[PDB]
Amino acid sequence: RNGRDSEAKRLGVKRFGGESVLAGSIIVRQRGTKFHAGANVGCGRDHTLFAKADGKVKFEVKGPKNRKFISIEAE
Amino acid sequence: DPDDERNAFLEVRAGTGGDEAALFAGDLFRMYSRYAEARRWRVEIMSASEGEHGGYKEIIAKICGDGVYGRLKFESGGHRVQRVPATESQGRIHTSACTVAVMPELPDAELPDINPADLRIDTFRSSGAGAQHVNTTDSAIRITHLPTGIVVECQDERSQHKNKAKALSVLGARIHAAEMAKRQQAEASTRRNLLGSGDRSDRNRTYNFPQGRVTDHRINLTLYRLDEVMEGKLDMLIEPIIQEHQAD
Amino acid sequence: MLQPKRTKFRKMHKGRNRGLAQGTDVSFGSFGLKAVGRGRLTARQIEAARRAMTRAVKRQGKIWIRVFPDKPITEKPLAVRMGKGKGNVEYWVALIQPGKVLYEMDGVPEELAREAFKLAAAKLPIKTTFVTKTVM
Amino acid sequence: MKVRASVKKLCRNCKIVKRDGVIRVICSAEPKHKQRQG
RNA sequence: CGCGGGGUGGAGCAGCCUGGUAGCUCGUCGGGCUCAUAACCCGAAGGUCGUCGGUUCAAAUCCGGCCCCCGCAACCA
RNA sequence: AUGUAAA
RNA sequence: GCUCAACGGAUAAAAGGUACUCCGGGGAUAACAGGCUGAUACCGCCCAAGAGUUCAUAUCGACGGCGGUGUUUGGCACCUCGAUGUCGGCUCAUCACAUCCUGGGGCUGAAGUAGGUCCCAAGGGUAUGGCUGUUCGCCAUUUAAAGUGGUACGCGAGCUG
RNA sequence: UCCUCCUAAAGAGUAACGGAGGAGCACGAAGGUUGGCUAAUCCUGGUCGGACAUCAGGAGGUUAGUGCAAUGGCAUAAGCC
RNA sequence: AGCCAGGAUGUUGGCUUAGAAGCAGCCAUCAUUUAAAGAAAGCGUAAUAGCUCACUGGUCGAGUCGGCCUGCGCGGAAGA
């Protein structure tokens, strides 16, 4: 009766904090919104936060309900 | 006694003159229904086979409660009917007989334990054909039930368990059939003793409509009522029978 | 037999019985049957241990059952090869850690509870001991 | 005589003996309580 | 529990596929016809389609969930 | 189509 | 324009039987057996309601549990497909005791005989005919008994088929 | 063939005739922008109205909803007009 | 711990009047003499009677009775 299982979509955090990324690089592949768009970070229709500048990635815990934010500092 | 407080089965059947005796069996259902609703008894019609000119040929009916069989012990037997018979276009007298059986509860304590400690299981090699497995593997099971003497032989399939389940189902079916056959023989041997041939012979109850009297052999009772008799109120006739039955 | 009513899933994994016990302190009764051995108790074992402890401690008193199995264990039909799906649900086990309170009892003398917990330990496979509720 | 593996004192007159290594439970009152290896 | 057939007067069926109307037969009761029984005729009761949520102007119907009945469940060349 | 049994 | 759903699609177009079979192979993979385990089976023990005129423990024993053996069914395929002949029968036996009898003892719900249960003890013995190819089973009659199993659930380079 | 949770050992990935389920569509709007709003479930009162029509008040907080079986997410609303 | 002693008068107690009487089951589980005695733990009787222990004396005269934690052992543990 069982046996069906899907191919994985390879989600997760591709670019961790501290590493300098180029413009347009995919940072976090996530299903929903576990991370939110902060400074110099764009959001797509697939909820994929991508880079918009050449800097380092910084994770922040701002907001009322302690939601995560990705920021990019122009280093 | 335990049986006394027990419920009962009433079986009112038509004897001689099946056209007329069906009409009197309907009246006996009416008799014991008016006798049953007086002392608040439950009446349920389990089976009733209709006649031709009205009434019923056979009535099997459960009456439940507290003390039906102990109060209605003495009703198994014949009932003679002298009456202008509804049927006669001419109108002459006749003996219409009806037979009434009174059965106790006998509650069903069925399905005893199969007792595998008492089951002798012989797992031996099989006969027939088919393969190598017949030579070495057994694939044949015989189970004997010791206190009953029932032997079940299974040589059907390859694995023993799939034959063990069949052998236990056949053990359960044969034990249940042998117990229900003894129960149906114990019912029939008492029903042949309580219900007679159905003839008009005098069997403990005498009825007399154009005279106004009914005489009961089972302790002579010669009471000329039949109007406080036809609608319930049968305790008086029944009570002295119990009075001189408790003396013995 | 103790059996759950309409759970979310019918069958679950085997798992291991690692970790220490949580139900150590006696909380309801004045005494208790604390289990020492690490094992697994089927629901028939709890029901039989209730049967042959309840009769000796008579109609007075009060007994608490501190455990519930809520873990389905299957069994394959015999002369059936390996695989072909998980088996049908047959019984229910409680994984009992070292030092787990199984039964508690109040309203009885100490000797009667001592003699009843010996029979309850005899009906169970795992090794138990005898404890008493200390105040705080 | 009883040939069980666990031996307890049945009545008050039971005595634990260690004859030849074999633990026995002797009884001077009732012969039925005399038993074997434990 | 897994699969299939379903749940339509008291009972058996249409009608479900393909939505816009509750229908037929047997049965129950009562009355005529006969002096009566059988037959025939007439009238009445009876089910909202097992129940519940959604689409639809409209669910007896289409779909899904729950309850109940019956049958099927590892062989074997 | 039928309608048993006691002058 | 493809439910080319065998869905990275061999043709646009294709179901079955072989015990008449035949070849290249495989223990990569089954059957018989040997190997590992013991779900199952047999046997032993713990607890105890209860049956037994009283009385759990003379004899049984539910509800429950723990162990031994590899004798049944099982599970995996470790060895065998450049070959290990197996069921039943006849002859020939060997070994273990979880003992059928004989022997020595304990309890008894053992007045004696005849008994029930259990411990030690394998030295010896452990049926005759009908049916069925049958092992097994039933029947008839003996016996003190008509023991359970292992040895490729023995034995075809000893014999039939 | 494909999608969702576990298996899966806290990056990615990960097998079994493993445990639970679905899809072979639909949409001219349910899409874009702008503007505005916050439900489910209970309690009280009210003609039909009765456990549940609707409205007013109160609790409650996103247990509601997101076309679809499941996961993540959602008020700055991705929910509703 | 052993040893000669004690371990009572009404309790045939009311209870379902056939009897449960210290000891089937009910409940009460008194109180005196007191070195001591439970209106009773067991055996035995249709019930009694009777026999022991509870407890108390005396001879005696030094350590003893019951639980917890573990180390090493015993038995369960029988094959070809």
Explained architecture:
This is part of a larger assembly, with chains A (75 residues), B (248 residues), C (136 residues) and D (38 residues). With 75 residues, chain A is mostly beta strands. Chain A has one domain (11-75). Chain A has strands spanning 12-13, 20-21, 26-29, 35-37, 41-43, 49-51, 55-60, 68-73. Chain B has 248 residues and is of the alpha+beta class. Helix content of chain B is 27%, strand content 24%. Chain B has helices at residues 18-36, 133-136, 161-194, 235-245; strands at residues 8-14, 42-50, 56-64, 77-82, 95-103, 119-123, 141-145, 150-154, 214-215, 222-223. In chain B, a hairpin with a 4-residue loop joins strand 7 (141-145) and strand 8. Chain B starts with 7 loop residues before the first strand and ends with a helix. Chain C has 136 residues and is of the alpha+beta class. Chain D is built from no helices and two strands. Chain D has a two-stranded antiparallel ribbon. Chain D is globular, with a radius of gyration of 9 Å. The interface between B and C is small, with 4 and 3 residues. Chain B binds five RNA strands through helix 1, strand 6, helix 2 and helix 3.
Task: Describe the structure concisely.
Chain A is mainly beta.
Indicate the topology.
This is part of a larger assembly, with chains A (75 residues), B (248 residues), C (136 residues) and D (38 residues).
Chain A: E1 12-13, E2 20-21, E3 26-29, E4 35-37, E5 41-43, E6 49-51, E7 55-60, E8 68-73
Parallel strand pairs in A: 4-8
Antiparallel strand pairs in A: 1-3, 2-7, 3-6, 5-6, 7-8
Chain B: E1 8-14, H1 18-36, E2 42-50, E3 56-64, E4 77-82, E5 95-103, E6 119-123, H2 133-136, E7 141-145, E8 150-154, H3 161-194, E9 214-215, E10 222-223, H4 235-245
Antiparallel strand pairs in B: 1-3, 1-5, 2-3, 4-5, 6-7, 7-8, 9-10
Chain C: E1 31-35, E2 39-42, H1 43-54, E3 62-65, E4 72-75, E5 88-96, E6 100-106, H2 110-123, E7 128-132
Antiparallel strand pairs in C: 1-6, 1-7, 2-5, 3-6, 4-5
Helix pairs in contact in C: 1-2
Chain B binds 5 RNA strands through residues 16-20, 52-53, 85, 87-89, 92-96, 121-127, 130-140, 142, 144, 151, 153, 157-162, 164.
Net shape of chain D: globular
The oligomeric status of these chains comes to part of a larger assembly
The separation of the N and C termini of chain C measures 34 Å
- Which fold name corresponds to the CATH topology of chain C? Aldehyde Oxidoreductase, domain 3
Helix content of chain C: 10-25%
Keywords (chain A): Ribonucleoprotein, Ribosomal protein, RNA-binding, rRNA-binding, tRNA-binding
Subunit structure (chain A): Part of the 50S ribosomal subunit. Cross-links to the 23S rRNA. Cross-links to the A and P site tRNAs.
Organism (chain A): Escherichia coli (strain K12)
InterPro entries (chain A): Ribosomal_bL27, Ribosomal_bL27_CS
